[PDB]
Ligand binder design. Structure first.
Ligand code: MG
Ligand code: MG
Ligand code: MG
Ligand code: MG
Ligand code: MG
Ligand code: MG
Ligand code: MG
Ligand code: MG
Ligand code: MG
Ligand code: MG
Ligand code: MG
Ligand code: MG
Ligand code: MG
Ligand code: MG
Ligand code: MG
Ligand code: MG
Ligand code: MG
Ligand code: MG
Ligand code: MG
Ligand code: MG
Ligand code: ZN
Lengths: 53, 122, 116, 110
RNA sequence: UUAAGUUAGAAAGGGCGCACGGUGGAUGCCUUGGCACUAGGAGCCGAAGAAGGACGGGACUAACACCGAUAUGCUUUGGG
RNA sequence: CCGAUAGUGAACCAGUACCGUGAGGGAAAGGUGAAAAGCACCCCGGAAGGGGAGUGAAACAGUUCCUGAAACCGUGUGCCU
RNA sequence: GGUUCGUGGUAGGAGAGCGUUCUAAGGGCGGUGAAGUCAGACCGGAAGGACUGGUGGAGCGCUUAGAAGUGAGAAUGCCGGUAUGAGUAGCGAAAGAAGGGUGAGAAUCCCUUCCACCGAAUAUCUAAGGUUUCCUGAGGAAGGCUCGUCCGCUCAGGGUU
């Protein structure tokens, strides 16, 4: 029900070892020349890097 | 099949609404989960369209929404979503066996991080 | 006249917290647990100034025992021998010879054997 | 040699800003800006404006080479907390901390 | 090369030390306000409408202070 | 005698705010600088907020702004794991 | 000055002292940097005291006496600040969708269409009660359990015959 003891700084920090973001999966486009998510449409060019729209 | 955080009747309503939107506008932006369900339902409506006969028209009519796409002017008469499906959309896919839709991944929505996509006829 | 509690309190508590330098977590930060930790450290250090003297005599005796058994004497026989011989060299000096100048230790071990 | 920007008393919780700022620390500014663009978090837009401000400072004030810049330092300090109350059951009110952040980004040549 | 043996190094994260920040408002210095008294004065106001108020009054006026449809002031005597 | 948790409840528009049907209960809250000289102008930004430039003895004195402890939150790293 | 015997200690008795604010008197320090504050490997048997350097920016020691609001770690103490639990519980009955628009920015604001819900009400009056919440134009700090270009919110004007 309730914490028996307060959690120490060390223990709190150990618990948060896995609470983090991963870097996004991105890469530079050829036509744009700027970063884009893989398998997404590149807004800089304004279409899908390969398939023209 | 996907339950889209909706009861059975709510989900049928949603699928009919989006199906009609994609037939009317030919390109809509929605969530990935919705798009992956819509492709199944829209490609079956286009199949009915390709079949073309009265029985298929009435099967489509049971699903498609009674929406006016446009007014053509001959007198001026409206064009209904069902008419567009059977007179405009269906014929353009006469020689194409399946795969009437495509889903382009767009990116996450600001307010809920929902992964948004374009689904379009082609 | 009023005496407000200014500075003397902070000065006293900060000294105790500085004495708890190196202690784990709250023990080097917070006066209440630092003050316990410092009191306890002082109590251990007092106890261990006595225990240190016992510990080093046990180390020396063990080394004298090892070096004496290499001369076919036990520690108990060698020390008896040195007493009878009249040799007053203390265990810290014997242990030092047994590590650093074994030749000299063997000379004393001979003096012990002779007295026995 | 280096250029800094700060966003003081931004109305976002420090923990929420830090989990993002940790991605861009040590990265080249081009990659850093990309990482923020494609990290879907409330903090990403705020940190982007601080970083682009720091880059503008580096280019306009100190005449550094923008193509050559790296995020030397990035950190989030606690700002002053807004104290609020949520009414709970049985007449009791529970505290709500509307925490704020000071977001610092330093950029440097290499 | 094989075998047997020995020893190094590592950090997802953490600890200690140090440096630099943030938060926070302790401490010091300060005083617009208080506290206790002393000496002197004064110890009542009101139907000639009191104490205390309400609403108003300014070029624009929300508040305070001041004033009362003569309203952010009027007459007069002195001071300056 | 007190020196802002003190001294009046009240150094600050306080018997106010606020609580209570009402009688009644009843706070918190002082300090830019000698002087506003209160940051022209440029830059990023919708703004906020910054970075320069300038004022100043000082701006790490920047309109709540003398000092600025501790808890607490971070960044960096010498030794350890 | 030696000699001899002593020097564990709760309640408790006895003694000597440290430090704090104020006063007096002597004598000083201080913009060539006071108090405070931070740091340090210094000094004394203890309480404690210096020195040096940073910060600070104007007051403060010392000696001898005097007087006390004179020393805090505990009171489920009082007030303030900040943790922990934790990115956890929760986000308060319910159907939404897409297109178009606005905007720095849109699941959340506006418009359109379809869908869905109440319908002896979830509709229309009206008393009480509230007291400007009403309308229009600006706004987006805070409030709104998210967002916000929007609002019963903020700022202006208005409005009740
Ligand atoms: Mg049903
Ligand atoms: Mg209730
Ligand atoms: Mg008071
Ligand atoms: Mg103070
Ligand atoms: Mg301030
Ligand atoms: Mg004794
Ligand atoms: Mg004894
Ligand atoms: Mg006594
Ligand atoms: Mg003093
Ligand atoms: Mg201080
Ligand atoms: Mg006392
Ligand atoms: Mg306490
Ligand atoms: Mg849990
Ligand atoms: Mg859970
Ligand atoms: Mg949940
Ligand atoms: Mg709700
Ligand atoms: Mg009924
Ligand atoms: Mg309205
Ligand atoms: Mg909000
Ligand atoms: Mg609006
Ligand atoms: Zn591209």
């Amino acid at each position: 029900a309730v914490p028996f003891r307060r959690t120490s700084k060390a223990k709190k920090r150990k618990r948060r070892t896995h609470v983090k973001l991963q870097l996004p999966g991105m890469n530079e486009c050829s036509n744009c020349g700027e970063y884009r998510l893989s398998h997404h449409v590149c807004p800089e060019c304004g279409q899908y890097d390969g398939k023209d729209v | 099949y996907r339950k889209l955080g909706r009861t059975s009747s709510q989900r049928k309503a949603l699928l009919r609404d989006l199906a009609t939107d994609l037939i009317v506008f030919e390109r809509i932006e929605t969530t990935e989960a919705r798009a992956k369900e819509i492709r199944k339902v829209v490609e079956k409506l286009i199949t009915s369209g390709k079949k073309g006969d009265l029985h298929a028209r009435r099967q489509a009519a049971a699903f498609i929404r009674h929406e006016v796409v446009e007014v053509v002017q001959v007198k001026n008469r409206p064009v209904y979503a069902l008419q567009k499906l059977f007179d405009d959309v269906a014929p353009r896919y006469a020689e194409r066996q399946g795969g009437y839709t495509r889903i382009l991944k767009k990116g996450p929505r600001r307010g809920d991080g929902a992964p948004m996509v374009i689904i379009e006829l082609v | 006249p009023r005496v407000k509690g200014g500075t003397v309190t902070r000065k006293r508590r900060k000294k105790i917290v500085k004495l708890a330098k190196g202690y784990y977590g709250s023990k080097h930060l917070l006066f209440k647990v630092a003050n316990q930790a410092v009191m306890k450290s002082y109590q251990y250090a007092y106890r261990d100034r006595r225990q240190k003297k016992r510990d080093f005599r046990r180390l020396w005796i063990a080394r004298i025992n090892a070096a004496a058994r290499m001369q076919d004497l036990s520690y108990s026989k060698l020390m008896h021998g040195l007493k009878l011989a009249g040799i007053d060299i203390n265990r810290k000096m014997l242990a030092d010879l047994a590590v650093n100048d074994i030749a000299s230790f063997n000379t004393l071990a001979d003096s012990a054997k002779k007295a026995l | 040699t280096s250029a800094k920007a700060v966003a003081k008393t931004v109305r976002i919780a420090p923990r929420k800003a830090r989990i993002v700022i940790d991605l861009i620390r040590g990265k080249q500014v081009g990659e850093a800006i990309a990482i923020l663009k494609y990290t879907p978090r409330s903090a990403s837009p705020i940190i982007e404006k601080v970083l682009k401000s720091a880059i503008a400072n580096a280019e306009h004030n100190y005449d550094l080479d923008i193509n050559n810049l790296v995020v030397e330092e990035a950190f989030v300090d606690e700002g002053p907390t807004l104290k609020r109350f949520r009414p709970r059951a049985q007449g009791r009110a529970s505290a709500i901390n509307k925490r704020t952040s000071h977001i610092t980004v330093v950029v440097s040549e290499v």
